[PDB]
Amino acid sequence: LDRGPSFKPYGGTAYNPLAPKSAPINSAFTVGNDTHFVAQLPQTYAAGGTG
Amino acid sequence: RNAVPNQVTERKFLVDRYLWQIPFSSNFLNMGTLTDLGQNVMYANSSHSLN
Numbered sequence: 001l002d003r004g005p006s007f008k009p010y011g012g013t014a015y016n017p018l019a020p021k022s023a024p025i026n027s028a029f030t031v032g033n034d035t036h037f038v039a040q041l042p043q044t045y046a047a048g049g050t051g
Numbered sequence: 052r053n054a055v056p057n058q059v060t061e062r063k064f065l066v067d068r069y070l071w072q073i074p075f076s077s078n079f080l081n082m083g084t085l086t087d088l089g090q091n092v093m094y095a096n097s098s099h100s101l102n
Contacts, residue, residue, distance in 0.1 A: 005052040 026039040076086045
């Protein structure tokens, strides 16, 4: 039996279900001329100026 | 829309509190409390083993 692409046997989603719906992931997207970075850097390391 | 193909089906069941039974009758029915093979001449007036 095939059920077609119209089959989804549940509500909501199964991938990142706790996220707010307007949230972007850390991405690089180009608007016309050059890219815009948007990111979140949770893990840090040691820098000492001009790192 | 983009479900993975060639997926395979797995089935099982769960009985709880049941304790499976095989009746000692000819047609596996309940025709009496004293069953029909219990008053048979082959089983009453003889002696048999069981394995």
